[PDB]
Amino acid sequence: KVTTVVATPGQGPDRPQEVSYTDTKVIGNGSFGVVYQAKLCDSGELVAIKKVLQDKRFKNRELQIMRKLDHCNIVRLRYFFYSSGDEVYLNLVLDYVPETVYRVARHYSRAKQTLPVIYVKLYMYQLFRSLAYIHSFGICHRDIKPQNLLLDPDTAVLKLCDFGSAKQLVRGEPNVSYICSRYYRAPELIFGATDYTSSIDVWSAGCVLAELLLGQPIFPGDSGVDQLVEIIKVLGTPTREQIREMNPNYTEFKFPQIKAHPWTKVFRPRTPPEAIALCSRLLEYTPTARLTPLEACAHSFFDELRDPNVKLPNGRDTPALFNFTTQELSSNPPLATILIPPHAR
Ligand SMILES: CC(C)(C)Cc1[nH]nc2c1[C@](C)(c1ccccc1)C1=C(CC(C)(C)CC1=O)N2
């Protein structure tokens, strides 16, 4: 049974073509609508179709954002197209990838084991790459979690997915506080800040990093507000100057004073010292103090990835790690001296 639709390519001239697919099954769910799997008849390739009720009044924020993006570490919009059920739906044809960082991290910790640190370097490097790219367009993902990191287990290619909460932030225009998933939610946001930057994504990224070294979430909060407490147990009570730097909308938390539990004691003994150094510069109260995604790719914890002889545990080559663009380097072009090593010209 074959379905044919007239779909506009996402990274293409605005020019609709016939597309056919088969083997439709449901795989996903949300306030938005539903996600299906299908097999394209052309390539036999597997894809996901995200089906979203779309008020013809509005543009679809996710769609505008997805049409700009073109990146090895971001899920690609192959096609999009409209359908019926007045009912008008947007369908987004996106990559299907069989695993996630959530699932892999979970296999390791159901077995009490540590995810090998090579994979931590591989996965995190690619996540920071993906954020460098979108942050360069002023786009904040605002939902970085291990579950939104797609993962081809054989190639080690990580792809950032799910841009339902993503947005272009412009200084001046305020934004919602209760955003991101709780465990990965920056403290600015729990203070009610509406004037935040894309450095919230970096907080979340350091939460993913921490989780991958600990085997469970670093801040498992009972509620959007117990989330602060969980954080405070680790970083300790924020100073008056840190609280000011979060440009809050409410500080009346009447929180006890807790001393900072130092970083090296948070992780299991003989965690590599560079992972902790990176981790502490992401999970900072002051949002302006956190590394930019691109400095984070340049960090010395990822040096193993820049070694000429580096290979995956399954024998194969690493994915493309060094093929930076000008768009992708914009925020700090000198970093290319470190980022793109000798042996890749
Ligand atoms: C590109 C989408 C819209 C994000 C769909 C997609 N593309 N590739 C995927 C997905 C799913 C449907 C997804 C949905 C939401 C967030 C992340 C992932 C998905 C997988 C792996 C699993 C094991 C089947 C679990 C699963 O939910 N892989």
XYZ file of C-alpha atoms and ligand atoms in Angstrom:
373
model
C 0.000 0.000 0.000
C 1.628 3.185 -1.299
C 0.976 6.844 -0.368
C 2.031 9.601 -2.796
C 2.178 13.211 -1.734
C 3.279 16.514 -3.106
C 6.044 17.580 -0.718
C 8.347 20.568 -0.821
C 11.986 19.718 -0.064
C 13.237 21.483 3.133
C 16.752 22.465 2.022
C 15.748 23.222 -1.573
C 14.283 25.759 -4.007
C 10.628 26.263 -3.058
C 9.595 23.575 -5.697
C 7.093 20.704 -4.816
C 7.594 17.218 -6.245
C 5.742 13.889 -5.927
C 7.061 11.662 -3.070
C 5.976 8.142 -2.312
C 6.376 6.065 0.780
C 5.158 2.922 2.507
C 5.184 0.824 5.731
C 3.546 3.469 7.858
C 3.575 2.923 11.664
C 3.152 5.190 14.719
C 6.260 5.818 16.835
C 5.631 9.118 18.707
C 3.329 11.541 20.405
C 2.950 15.014 21.903
C 0.843 18.099 22.393
C 1.676 18.779 18.701
C 0.196 15.589 17.161
C 1.863 12.307 16.161
C 5.030 10.843 14.643
C 5.098 8.090 12.078
C 7.739 5.968 10.496
C 7.775 5.359 6.729
C 9.940 3.885 4.042
C 10.587 5.977 0.958
C 9.994 3.955 -2.227
C 12.808 5.768 -4.121
C 15.760 4.935 -1.797
C 14.085 2.337 0.449
C 15.282 4.686 3.265
C 13.511 4.969 6.601
C 12.178 8.273 7.830
C 9.984 9.905 10.417
C 6.957 12.015 9.596
C 6.010 14.467 12.315
C 2.307 15.328 11.799
C 1.204 18.634 13.422
C -2.223 20.389 13.426
C -1.454 23.765 11.848
C -3.738 26.762 12.255
C -3.482 28.415 8.780
C -3.492 31.809 10.567
C 0.098 31.174 11.811
C 3.390 30.175 10.428
C 4.930 27.123 12.078
C 7.922 28.239 14.172
C 9.535 24.764 13.886
C 9.256 24.782 10.125
C 10.795 28.242 9.640
C 13.652 27.107 11.830
C 14.098 23.735 10.124
C 14.269 25.296 6.602
C 17.378 27.322 7.571
C 19.342 24.405 9.127
C 21.801 22.225 7.196
C 24.177 20.378 9.437
C 25.688 16.920 9.805
C 24.853 16.878 13.569
C 21.260 18.140 13.151
C 18.340 15.942 12.012
C 17.575 17.028 8.443
C 14.167 18.030 7.120
C 13.986 16.014 3.898
C 10.497 17.184 2.903
C 7.441 18.813 4.269
C 3.946 18.722 3.047
C 0.311 19.352 3.936
C -2.643 16.987 4.428
C -6.170 16.681 5.924
C -8.097 14.723 8.654
C -11.163 22.798 8.080
C -8.545 20.361 9.425
C -5.087 21.227 7.924
C -1.908 19.390 9.079
C 1.767 20.110 8.461
C 3.801 16.949 7.995
C 7.567 17.093 8.429
C 9.665 14.369 6.835
C 12.703 14.031 8.981
C 15.491 11.546 9.503
C 14.769 8.334 11.363
C 17.606 7.184 13.543
C 17.277 3.907 15.474
C 18.882 4.818 18.886
C 19.314 7.756 21.263
C 21.861 8.794 23.897
C 19.123 8.218 26.405
C 18.750 4.581 25.488
C 22.465 3.836 25.305
C 23.298 5.622 28.562
C 20.401 3.548 30.060
C 21.746 0.195 28.862
C 25.050 1.003 30.630
C 23.548 2.075 33.914
C 20.875 -0.722 34.216
C 24.135 -2.772 34.241
C 25.761 -0.454 36.893
C 28.509 0.303 34.353
C 30.140 3.461 33.065
C 29.791 4.508 29.444
C 33.346 4.478 28.011
C 34.826 7.919 28.025
C 35.676 7.803 24.303
C 31.890 7.791 23.617
C 31.397 10.641 26.080
C 33.932 12.606 24.081
C 32.319 11.614 20.784
C 28.762 12.338 21.714
C 29.421 15.598 23.630
C 31.717 17.033 20.957
C 28.997 16.591 18.386
C 26.365 18.085 20.600
C 28.527 21.179 21.160
C 29.037 21.302 17.422
C 25.309 21.273 16.767
C 24.790 24.119 19.309
C 27.593 26.260 17.807
C 25.767 26.098 14.523
C 22.263 26.980 15.733
C 23.539 29.575 18.204
C 25.286 31.289 15.282
C 21.740 31.967 13.819
C 20.617 33.195 17.323
C 18.489 30.078 17.743
C 18.065 28.494 21.138
C 16.986 24.847 21.175
C 15.602 25.026 24.732
C 15.135 21.289 25.076
C 18.505 19.651 25.188
C 18.118 16.264 26.764
C 19.740 12.852 26.128
C 16.373 11.761 24.614
C 16.704 14.415 21.916
C 20.091 13.205 20.853
C 19.672 10.742 17.975
C 22.463 8.229 17.602
C 23.555 5.837 14.845
C 25.295 3.241 17.072
C 27.573 1.899 14.261
C 28.879 5.276 12.866
C 28.802 7.145 16.187
C 26.956 10.059 14.474
C 24.904 12.093 16.890
C 22.106 14.268 15.578
C 20.292 16.883 17.570
C 16.559 16.455 17.073
C 13.149 17.814 18.201
C 12.933 21.604 17.608
C 9.360 22.001 18.929
C 10.502 24.384 21.696
C 13.276 26.040 19.639
C 13.247 29.819 19.058
C 15.189 32.817 17.758
C 16.006 35.026 20.737
C 16.455 38.751 20.165
C 17.696 40.972 23.034
C 14.771 42.971 24.422
C 11.977 40.556 23.511
C 11.112 38.601 26.663
C 10.670 34.786 26.749
C 9.046 32.056 28.813
C 10.786 30.792 32.020
C 9.146 27.362 32.304
C 10.942 25.926 29.361
C 13.343 22.945 28.950
C 12.968 19.689 30.720
C 13.301 20.092 34.430
C 16.468 18.079 35.034
C 18.253 19.979 32.333
C 16.754 23.388 33.141
C 19.094 26.327 33.778
C 18.835 28.170 37.106
C 18.100 31.578 35.500
C 14.901 29.957 34.313
C 13.912 28.638 37.686
C 14.407 32.160 39.031
C 11.748 33.304 36.454
C 14.232 35.079 34.154
C 12.536 36.175 30.871
C 15.664 37.908 29.464
C 17.841 34.769 29.032
C 20.341 33.853 26.355
C 21.176 30.749 24.423
C 23.597 29.886 27.221
C 20.619 27.951 28.771
C 21.328 25.213 26.173
C 24.906 24.991 27.505
C 23.707 24.490 31.059
C 21.597 21.645 29.744
C 24.563 20.272 27.810
C 26.685 20.186 30.952
C 23.772 18.309 32.645
C 23.989 15.719 29.880
C 27.794 15.553 30.302
C 27.453 15.109 34.058
C 24.813 12.400 33.627
C 27.063 10.492 31.237
C 29.889 10.455 33.797
C 27.552 9.631 36.772
C 25.173 7.194 35.156
C 22.131 9.076 36.507
C 20.898 12.676 36.359
C 22.943 15.112 38.427
C 19.953 17.207 39.468
C 16.763 15.005 39.859
C 14.193 17.523 41.046
C 10.699 16.709 42.399
C 9.341 19.892 40.908
C 10.356 22.929 38.897
C 11.282 24.539 42.212
C 12.863 21.541 43.962
C 15.083 21.632 40.870
C 16.800 24.701 42.399
C 17.440 22.844 45.643
C 19.006 19.852 43.843
C 21.358 22.267 42.025
C 22.172 24.125 45.229
C 23.214 20.868 46.931
C 25.993 20.623 44.363
C 27.042 24.162 43.490
C 26.017 25.537 46.871
C 23.928 28.635 47.529
C 24.397 31.250 44.840
C 26.004 34.525 45.882
C 24.165 37.865 45.781
C 26.173 38.759 42.619
C 25.306 35.433 40.922
C 21.654 35.902 41.786
C 21.868 39.406 40.169
C 23.504 37.996 37.007
C 20.532 35.609 36.508
C 18.269 38.797 36.105
C 15.496 37.108 37.908
C 11.792 37.817 38.337
C 11.477 36.313 41.871
C 14.128 35.345 44.493
C 11.775 34.718 47.431
C 12.721 31.065 47.719
C 13.705 31.219 51.470
C 16.403 28.598 50.654
C 18.813 27.361 53.370
C 22.544 28.226 52.999
C 24.463 25.204 51.644
C 28.295 25.091 51.126
C 29.620 24.189 47.665
C 30.244 20.438 47.358
C 33.533 20.596 45.329
C 33.499 19.237 41.761
C 36.067 16.449 41.981
C 34.107 14.745 44.799
C 30.809 14.712 42.811
C 32.102 12.085 40.293
C 33.474 8.614 40.793
C 37.133 8.516 41.656
C 39.469 8.622 38.650
C 37.013 10.411 36.374
C 39.412 12.123 33.926
C 40.297 15.586 35.331
C 39.544 17.329 31.979
C 35.903 16.093 32.056
C 35.438 17.736 35.448
C 37.182 20.969 34.248
C 34.768 21.150 31.304
C 31.784 20.210 33.433
C 32.472 23.006 35.959
C 32.632 25.697 33.258
C 29.285 24.693 31.775
C 27.388 24.301 35.060
C 27.962 27.822 36.339
C 25.299 30.001 37.943
C 26.324 33.080 36.022
C 25.133 32.509 32.464
C 27.776 34.720 30.932
C 30.444 32.662 32.681
C 29.602 29.458 30.812
C 31.647 28.376 27.821
C 30.251 29.051 24.359
C 29.522 25.824 22.497
C 32.522 26.515 20.258
C 35.014 26.980 23.117
C 33.567 23.764 24.483
C 34.460 21.912 21.239
C 37.942 23.468 21.615
C 38.339 22.130 25.146
C 41.204 19.828 26.002
C 38.891 16.930 27.020
C 38.158 16.428 23.319
C 41.907 16.295 22.378
C 41.688 12.494 21.929
C 39.284 13.162 19.016
C 41.942 15.325 17.311
C 44.570 12.565 17.493
C 45.518 11.350 13.918
C 45.200 7.688 14.998
C 41.891 7.880 16.779
C 39.338 5.220 15.890
C 36.036 4.005 17.207
C 35.847 1.016 19.549
C 34.282 -0.978 16.645
C 37.388 -0.376 14.509
C 35.927 2.186 12.134
C 36.834 5.816 11.578
C 35.333 8.600 13.564
C 32.708 10.700 11.823
C 33.499 14.054 10.277
C 34.589 16.223 13.173
C 36.722 18.935 11.546
C 34.819 20.156 8.523
C 33.751 23.432 10.081
C 32.127 26.162 8.062
C 32.504 29.910 8.278
C 28.892 30.166 9.615
C 29.853 27.554 12.210
C 33.084 29.389 13.296
C 31.603 32.941 13.274
C 31.496 33.616 17.067
C 35.317 33.013 17.466
C 37.175 32.149 14.170
C 40.696 31.917 15.739
C 39.587 28.747 17.571
C 40.042 26.950 14.167
C 43.760 26.761 14.922
C 42.795 24.312 17.739
C 39.564 22.889 16.277
C 40.845 21.915 12.845
C 44.145 20.119 13.418
C 47.213 19.661 11.029
C 46.242 16.284 9.609
C 42.832 17.445 8.164
C 43.245 19.990 5.303
C 12.889 13.214 14.171
C 11.882 12.892 15.271
C 10.648 13.787 15.126
C 12.536 13.230 16.603
C 11.408 11.438 15.185
C 12.498 10.424 15.305
N 13.534 10.206 14.478
N 14.407 9.161 14.863
C 13.892 8.691 16.007
C 12.666 9.404 16.371
C 11.865 9.099 17.620
C 10.466 8.625 17.213
C 11.995 10.311 18.534
C 10.916 11.102 18.932
C 11.073 12.230 19.764
C 12.341 12.594 20.231
C 13.423 11.799 19.847
C 13.260 10.668 19.024
C 12.493 7.944 18.341
C 13.753 7.304 17.849
C 14.372 6.159 18.619
C 13.285 5.337 19.320
C 14.039 4.207 19.974
C 12.311 4.667 18.348
C 12.541 6.227 20.324
C 11.927 7.454 19.650
O 11.034 8.111 20.172
N 14.366 7.702 16.741
